[PDB]
Amino acid sequence: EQESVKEFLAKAKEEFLKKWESPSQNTAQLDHFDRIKTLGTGSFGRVMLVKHKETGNHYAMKILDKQKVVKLKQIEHTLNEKRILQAVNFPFLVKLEFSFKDNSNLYMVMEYVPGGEMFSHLRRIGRFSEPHARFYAAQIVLTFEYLHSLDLIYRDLKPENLLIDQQGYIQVTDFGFAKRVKGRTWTLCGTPEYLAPEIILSKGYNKAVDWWALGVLIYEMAAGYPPFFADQPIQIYEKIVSGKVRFPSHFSSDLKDLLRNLLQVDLTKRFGNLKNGVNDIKNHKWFATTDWIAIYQRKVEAPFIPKFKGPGDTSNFDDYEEEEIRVSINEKCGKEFTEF
Numbered sequence: 386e387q388e389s390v391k392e393f394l395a396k397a398k399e400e401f402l403k404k405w406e407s408p409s410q411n412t413a414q415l416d417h418f419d420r421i422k423t424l425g426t427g428s429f430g431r432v433m434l435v436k437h438k439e440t441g442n443h444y445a446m447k448i449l450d451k452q453k454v455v456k457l458k459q460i461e462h463t464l465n466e467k468r469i470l471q472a473v474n475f476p477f478l479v480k481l482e483f484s485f486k487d488n489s490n491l492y493m494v495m496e497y498v499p500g501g502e503m504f505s506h507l508r509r510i511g512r513f514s515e516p517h518a519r520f521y522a523a524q525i526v527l528t529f530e531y532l533h534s535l536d537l538i539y540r541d542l543k544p545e546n547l548l549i550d551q552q553g554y555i556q557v558t559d560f561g562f563a564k565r566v567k568g569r570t571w572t573l574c575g576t577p578e579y580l581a582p583e584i585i586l587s588k589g590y591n592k593a594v595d596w597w598a599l600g601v602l603i604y605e606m607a608a609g610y611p612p613f614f615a616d617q618p619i620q621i622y623e624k625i626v627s628g629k630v631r632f633p634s635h636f637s638s639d640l641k642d643l644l645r646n647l648l649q650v651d652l653t654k655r656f657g658n659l660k661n662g663v664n665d666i667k668n669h670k671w672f673a674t675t676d677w678i679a680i681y682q683r684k685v686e687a688p689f690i691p692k693f694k695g696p697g698d699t700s701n702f703d704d705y706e707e708e709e710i711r712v713s714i715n716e717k718c719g720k721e722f723t724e725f
């Protein structure tokens with residue numbers, strides 16, 4: 386609305402498109418780093434703390450096995466992830482420093498954020514007060530304003546993907562489902578508790594699914610548990626498509642009103658997806674105390690600072706079996722990953 390916001394977003398889009406159209410490639414190699422510790426694992430990849438041998442700097446290295454990426458139908462998703470991360474720039478997104486590939490794997494070398502996942506702190510404290518939840522939610526609102534103005538949808542908002550930095554601010558990690566979308570998209574993906582009804586029903590869907598997921602995240606931060614849950618995914622999906630939501634009595638009236646408009650099952654009536662876009666959220670009464678410019682500038686004192694001893698501390702992450710990073714003598718899946 387204000388011309389200063391319009392010109393900020395226009396410059397952000399110009400700088401994104403220049404890097405999008407000419408991506409960087411092949412900017413390091415594996416024997417430039419020492420392996421320290423496994424920080425997370427999944428069905429086709431893992432994340433490892435590493436140290437660069439010449440500079441001494443620490444990084445979070447995401448390692449993807451090419452053969453498993455193909456088998457689980459993730460080729461286009463992994464190419465989206467790396468092409469988007471090398472082109473974006475925003476205070477609340479983890480930065481990609483290097484990328485490269487070898488006979489067996491794809492590598493994305495990110496900044497290391499030592500404070501841990503928001504999920505760990507939420508479960509240890511029980512629930513966040515409304516001011517504490519609001520500080521984190523404001524950073525997500527600004528991040529989605531940025532991403533959506535570049536025609537990007539994020540599609541994986543949840544507490545495990547939000548890391549807490551040395552200042553107590555959020556860094557969003559894991560762009561494995563992020564995509565450049567000018568109209569609608571159709572892939573079934575995401576985590577069950579956070580999916581909007583139009584994903585579950587196999588519709589063509591848009592950026593409104595990120596604003597639904599922000600309603601699930603704010604509910605989970607302020608209550609301690611998500612609004613839709615069950616033992617089996619089909620039962621979760623039945624609750625989501627009903628959209629019946631019960632709120633704890635300790636929620637303020639302003640919080641309940643915001644959540645009824647983000648958790649709106651009709652996508653054409655959902656906040657974030659109306660004529661006024663993000664400003665229906667930024668101007669809602671639950672955000673009346675938020676200084677949007679001071680949050681962007683990192684000038685607000687955070688609700689807490691994680692406890693850690695230095696840039697290589699891993700005490701806020703958990704323990705996994707330590708496995709080899711094997712590189713085959715023969716090249717695998719070369720054609721499929723030519724652009725990486």
Ligand SMILES: C#CCN(C)Cc1nc(C2(O)CCNCC2)cs1
Nearest residue numbers: 457458459460461462570571572573
């Ligand atoms: C290889 C090959 C030919 N396949 C039909 C290609 C395939 N594409 C998929 C997608 O889910 C990838 C994400 N965009 C939507 C389609 C699954 S299988």
Ligand SMILES: C#CCN(C)Cc1nc(C2(O)CCNCC2)cs1
Nearest residue numbers: 504543544545578609610611614615
């Ligand atoms: C708290 C509590 C009680 N549970 C029934 C709550 C639940 N929490 C989950 C999640 O693990 C899903 C993924 N992100 C974080 C929360 C599933 S069911």
